[PDB]
Structures are given as structure tokens and as C-alpha cells.
């Protein structure tokens, strides 16, 4: 008989929860048609602008000057043009201002210090493709739509059949949900897919945080993991953003996030170390098992593959 498989996505903002959801529609659903991709132009541009602005704002706080002082006019002009360009379209004027700002060594200098502030991980993706994106005959591709960033009004979800199972994937995130909603989200869970942004290991801590992003995520995992209520619940761990991690580990040591770390600075050892920090949180290595996968939420191929395995674990953890 058909089983309802209630999947709950958990994890800090930016961990990739929303992105896994979209991957499900592309893989186990229809995906996005052209009539529907065209629909995202407005957001693709909205996001592109918000990104260059996030960086421009960062230059102020961090006091990083433009490689060329002319850019100050562009920056000031960025905010006017932006707040004046009908959504969905981008003029040859705005495209220029952005291209010049993104090209500035001062701005690139600030971009390289994104660890000191909060820059979404789509800024690079879009700012580089300005050539394509800016052209007026532009049609967002699937990967373009996958990288977008929209509204989490309430709770996001998707229904899809895979290996004859009725998958219901849930994802809250930002939407303050009370013990009400929460208890109601947990009740019925078949598997919790906990997302972690590996690349967050080098983030400078905020003025409010006692511990860093990683350890805050570690803390939450700990609870979800060792909570008797989720005993029979399959606990999949997605150590996401491995591409950014690999790119980063090169320049920024893991000792930033785990001062005691003494291994080498290879994607391999650093990654293995983080996999242990999370899995050692498990208080019943005998009782429960953690299903860890290093992934790249934005990679449809890898996600399809990884979700293929998660299902096997679900298909049989149901002791059958």
C-alpha cells in the first residue's frame, strides 16, 4: 500500500533548505517551463541588485574604498536607477553601473571579505553572468531559477511521488512558528533532513552570538538528534555547500571555527572533521544512526543522486 512519507527540512537560514525543495520539483516533478522561467526575470534582477548592494553596504561599514573613485557616482546612481526600474526589465544603463561596480578592485576586495558580513551565495552566480542576464532577450534558465531567492510566507512544501511513496516535504524558515506549528510539524515525521552550510565555518560572529554559526547549527542538531520523540524518525544529515567549502578551505583555515583542529587544510580532512563533530553529538551511536551526505543543493545531478539514497534508507528503515 501507499505510504505517506512526511519529510521535514531543518537547518539555519542559508543552509540550502529552500533549494532542496526546488530540486524536488525539477527532479521528481514537472520542473519549470519556459512560460514559468520567464516569470522569474523580475526576481533574478531583484536578487542581482540586492547582491551588489549588499557588497556596497559592506564597503561602508568595513571602510573599503573603491579601486577607482568614479564608482562612487555609480554606487549613488545604483540606488536611484534601481528604485526606478520597472520590475522584470534591466536597462543598458543599470547593467553598466553594475558591471563597472562589480569590476572595481575595491568592490572585489570587499567581495573577498564576505566572511565579515552576510552575503547571500547567489551574488557571485549572478554578478558574473551580467552579460547574459542583462541582455533584454534574456530568458532565465532552470539553473537561473534554481538560484533565485523568494518569499517564505508561512511554510513551504511540495508533493511528489518517488518509488511509489507519497512524499510531502516541509520547510519553515524565518516564519516564526510557535510550539503549536512546531509540534504539529514534528508529529508525523518520517525523516528529518538537517541542512548545514559547511562554507559557514569561516563566518565572523555577530555582535549578538556567543558561539559561531557552525556550533549554533551543531547545538540544534544535537537536540533534534538525541530527542527520543524522533527515535524511529530517519535522521538524514546534509553537509551542504561543499563546493564553496572546497573553494574556501584553501584560504581560510578550519581553526577559525574549531580552534582545536590540528589536521591539514585539505577539503578531505576538514570535511571529515566536521562530519565527526556533528555525528559525535549522537548519544546513542548504537540506538540511532545518522545518514550523512556531503552535497551541493544547487547541483541537480548530485541532489537527485543523494535523494535517491535517502529514499532507500526511508524505504527500508520502515523495517521492510
Amino acid at each position: 500500500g501507499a505510504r505517506e512519507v512526511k519529510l521535514l527540512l531543518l537547518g539555519a537560514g542559508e543552509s540550502g533548505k529552500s533549494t532542496i525543495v526546488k530540486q524536488m520539483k525539477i527532479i521528481h516533478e514537472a520542473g519549470y517551463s519556459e512560460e514559468e522561467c520567464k516569470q522569474y526575470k523580475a526576481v533574478v534582477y531583484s536578487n542581482t541588485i540586492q547582491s551588489i548592494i549588499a557588497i556596497i553596504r559592506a564597503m561602508g561599514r568595513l571602510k573599503i574604498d573603491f579601486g577607482d573613485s568614479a564608482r562612487a557616482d555609480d554606487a549613488r546612481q545604483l540606488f536611484v536607477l534601481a528604485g526606478a526600474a520597472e520590475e522584470g526589465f534591466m536597462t543598458a544603463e543599470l547593467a553598466g553601473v553594475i558591471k563597472r561596480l562589480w569590476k572595481d578592485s575595491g568592490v572585489q576586495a570587499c567581495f573577498n571579505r564576505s566572511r565579515e558580513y552576510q552575503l547571500n551565495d547567489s551574488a557571485a552566480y549572478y554578478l558574473n553572468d551580467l552579460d547574459r542576464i542583462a541582455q533584454p532577450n534574456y530568458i532565465p534558465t532552470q539553473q537561473d531559477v534554481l538560484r533565485t531567492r523568494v518569499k517564505t510566507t508561512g511554510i513551504v512544501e511540495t508533493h511528489f511521488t518517488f518509488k511509489d511513496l507519497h512524499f510531502k516535504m516541509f520547510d519553515v524558515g524565518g516564519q516564526r512558528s510557535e510550539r503549536k506549528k512546531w509540534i504539529h510539524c514534528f508529529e508525523g515525521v518520517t525523516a528529518i533532513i538537517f541542512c548545514v552550510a559547511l562554507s559557514d565555518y569561516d563566518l565572523v560572529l555577530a555582535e549578538d552570538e556567543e558561539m559561531n554559526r557552525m556550533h549554533e547549527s551543531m547545538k540544534l542538531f544535537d537536540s533534534i538528534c538525541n530527542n527520543k520523540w524522533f527515535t524511529d524518525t530517519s535522521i538524514i544529515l546534509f553537509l551542504n555547500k561543499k563546493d564553496l567549502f572546497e573553494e574556501k578551505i584553501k584560504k581560510s583555515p578550519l581553526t577559525i571555527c574549531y580552534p582545536e583542529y590540528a589536521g591539514s587544510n585539505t577539503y578531505e580532512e576538514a570535511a571529515a572533521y566536521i562530519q565527526c563533530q556533528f555525528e559525535d553529538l549522537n548519544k546513542r551511536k548504537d540506538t540511532k544512526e545518522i545518514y550523512t551526505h556531503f552535497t551541493c543543493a544547487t547541483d541537480t545531478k548530485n541532489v537527485q543522486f543523494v535523494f535517491d539514497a535517502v529514499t532507500d534508507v526511508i524505504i527500508k528503515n520502515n523495517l521492510k
Binding site: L10, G11, A12, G13, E14, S15, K17, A42, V43, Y45, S46, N47, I49, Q50, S51, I53, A54, I56, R57, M59, G60, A75, R76, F79, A82, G83, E87, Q118, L119, N120, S122, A123, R149, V150, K151, T152, V172, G173, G174, R176, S177, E178, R179, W182, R213, E216, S217, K219, L220, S223, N227
Partner: protein, 35 residues
């Protein structure tokens, strides 16, 4: 439990890592102080 707190603190407080979300709104346009 505080569990509800932690989840609201980790999955929310970082969604800020994206005041960069949704369509463009007047708030995200306020010209930076270093004007």
C-alpha cells in the same frame, strides 16, 4: 521547550544573511550612510 527557541533562532536569525530576498522593496534601497 527551548527547542522551539533554538529552531527559531537558527533558521531565522540567519535568514537575515539575506535581506537579499524577494522582489526589490524601498527598504533595501536606502542609500548607505557613507553616502
Amino acid at each position: 521547550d527551548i527547542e522551539g527557541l533554538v529552531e527559531l533562532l537558527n533558521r531565522v536569525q540567519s535568514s537575515g544573511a539575506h535581506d537579499q530576498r524577494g522582489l526589490l522593496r524601498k527598504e533595501d534601497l536606502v542609500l548607505p550612510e557613507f553616502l
